[PDB]
Structure 1
Amino acid sequence: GVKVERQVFGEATKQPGITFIAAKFDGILGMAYPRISVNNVLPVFDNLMQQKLVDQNIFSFYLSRDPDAQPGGELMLGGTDSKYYKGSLSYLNVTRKAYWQVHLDQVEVASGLTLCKEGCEAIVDTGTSLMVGPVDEVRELQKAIGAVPLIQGEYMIPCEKVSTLPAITLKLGGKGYKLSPEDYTLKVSQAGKTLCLSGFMGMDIPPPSGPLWILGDVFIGRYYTVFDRDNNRVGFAEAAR
């Protein structure tokens, strides 16, 4: 393990609303750049680097996409883990060092709809489950695949329809990153029922930060991801499948 000394952190005393009540986790450990740290608190990974607790200042995520699989995932601090990807890593430069922000060349539904047609900005976010894009573009996307609105920018798809949906490909650094319908849809359960959630959510992030697409756990699940602070870049390889 590692011991990061003299780390400044929040002791939470108020959590209004419901989002943290039924969450499985106690807290959040942020791993983006110092620029977006509230109170300018030096982040954990930044402290770890300053204390030279790893040799390579990179970290990597494997996320399992079978909800019952063991292990559920792995974060590797200071390295990548070959157990969880096939082939070589392909890299993109970070554009704005705040979030882990990169240039997205386009998003294409196989049946022909193209979003982000002339390129746009995206962030790579382990802390959101779904892909996120602008409300209007996501609406078009969901219409193309036959999903229907649920609530707050989320959409559902009849489970028996999933296997015949078109693939959706994100173009990053000139390479295509395909998501099958199985990759971009999620099983959800409540009270003994099963439904299929569309893995794209519509949400408008205002300037100056936005607009932004978000590559969430849907993407990172298919594509093992490396976050590299030495070279300010993000790397993707096909995850173990």
Structure 2
Amino acid sequence: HAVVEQTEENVFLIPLKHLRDSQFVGTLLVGVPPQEIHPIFDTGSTNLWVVTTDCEEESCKKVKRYNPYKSKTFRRSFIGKNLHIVFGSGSISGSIGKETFVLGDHTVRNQTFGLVESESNNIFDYIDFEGIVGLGFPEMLSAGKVSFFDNLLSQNKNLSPQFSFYISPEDNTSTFLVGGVSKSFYEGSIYMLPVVKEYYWEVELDGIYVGEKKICCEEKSYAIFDTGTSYNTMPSAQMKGFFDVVPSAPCTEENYQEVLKNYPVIKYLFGDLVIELLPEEYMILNEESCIPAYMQIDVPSEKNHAYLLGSIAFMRHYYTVFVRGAGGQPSMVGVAKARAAA
């Protein structure tokens, strides 16, 4: 229903390195003179977060912090109001400010963002976290008047409102696409899925199957495309049964091939359209053990009826396009077979 951009001069590439801490980090230029940070790109949140020298905690000091006092464009915003975000694997606290950003070759001015000052209620002890580039919708902004992406587009009238994700951890060629897609990262056709609610990248979901067993959907369910979690998710209610059909297993570098030759195929249904995940696609080796790359998550608004597709269990196999709609224009998530390496 939408036309994805593909002209090789209007689509810009943001290489994403997959760190050993399970992070897909790009490059972002903060302030003037530019200070370089390596944030993650997140379709499950829209706040833009930067780690700053105001945080002298052990996990902050281990990274290249952004020094706002050396930047000549920094502006403290809502002076005297803190901002606290708590999720499943940690918490993030900080102050609000405005700064100039550079993403690839595009500049953004007067950009609201959060300065990380605390990470204390943790996973930031097991990762080198430097920031988050939020790619959800503006309604999800914990603070600020404009999403970083909407504002980037607002100031770059030549970009189409699209971005896509190519996930290739094997050869570390994962790329973030700004302004469209590329024949290099997918094959076959792109199938468009409408965004039902412009909060997360949320689309209708018609069922889930593990082999012949139907896991879903007895109720109106949804799917959320979240680059911030490497795992696929399932509600608490549904989770005890998933692992019940997808068990762990002993595996080795030379044994994984055989162990998984009996596992079921996971089929996600989006109307008449069926997406398949194979055992070697949804399983992973974790200390001589094959373990379903899945995780339990209850999305509050969705009444524990939302299922998430992560970077490793899904996007690594399916190229994903995100089409941001304007007033009256619906937003879409595009899914295509990822062109796999090696």
- Mapping of residues 134-145 of structure 1, within 5 Å: 134-145=235-246
Tell me the equivalent position of 2:277: 179
- How does the TM-score come out when normalised to structure 1? 0.86
Deviation digits for residues 83-128 of structure 1 (CA, Å, limit 9, x no counterpart): 1100110001100001111101100111333322454112111111
**Is residue 302 of structure 2 the alignment partner of residue 198 of structure 1?**
no
Greater relative contact order (CA < 8 Å, ≥ 6 in sequence):
1
Q: Provide the C-alpha distance between the structure 2 equivalents of 1:91 and 1:26, rounded to a whole number of angstroms.
A: 33
C-alpha displacement at 1:195, in angstroms?
Answer: 3.1
| Contact map agreement 2:197 2:203 (CA 8 A) in 1 | yes
Higher mean displacement: 92-101 or 21-30:
21-30
- Mapping of residues 1-241 of structure 1, within 5 Å: 1-16=105-120, 18-52=122-156, 54-66=158-170, 69-71=171-173, 73-145=174-246, 147=247, 156-159=248-251, 160=256, 161-188=259-286, 193-207=287-301, 210-217=304-311, 218-230=313-325, 231-241=330-340
Tell me the equivalent position of 2:4: none
Deviation digits for residues 16-75 of structure 1 (CA, Å, limit 9, x no counterpart): 152222224411111000001101442211111111254211000001153xx131x111
Q: Aligned Cα RMSD in Å? A: 1.9
Matched AA of 1:91 = M
| Contact map agreement 2:166 2:316 (CA 8 A) in 1 | yes
Matched AA of 1:85 = Y
Deviation digits for residues 131-183 of structure 1 (CA, Å, limit 9, x no counterpart): 111123121121112x2xxxxxxxx4332533321110101142110000111
Larger radius of gyration: 2
Give structure 1 stretches of 5+ with no counterpart: 148-155
| Contact map agreement 1:162 1:182 (CA 8 A) in 2 | yes
Tell me the equivalent position of 2:80: none
- How does the TM-score come out when normalised to structure 2? 0.62
Q: Secondary structure at the match of 2:196?
A: coil
| Contact map agreement 1:157 1:198 (CA 8 A) in 2 | no
| Contact map agreement 1:57 1:78 (CA 8 A) in 2 | yes
CA 1:157–1:57: 2 relative to 1, 3 Å? same
Q: Secondary structure at the match of 2:172?
A: coil
Q: Secondary structure at the match of 1:20?
A: helix
CA 1:209–1:185: 2 relative to 1, 3 Å? same
The count of aligned residue pairs is 225
Higher mean displacement: 108-117 or 219-228:
108-117
Share of identical aligned residues, percent? 31
Matched AA of 1:38 = S
| Contact map agreement 2:235 2:304 (CA 8 A) in 1 | no
Q: Secondary structure at the match of 2:146?
A: coil
Higher mean displacement: 95-104 or 194-203:
194-203
Higher helix share: 1
CA 1:60–1:54: 2 relative to 1, 3 Å? farther
Give structure 2 stretches of 5+ with no counterpart: 1-104
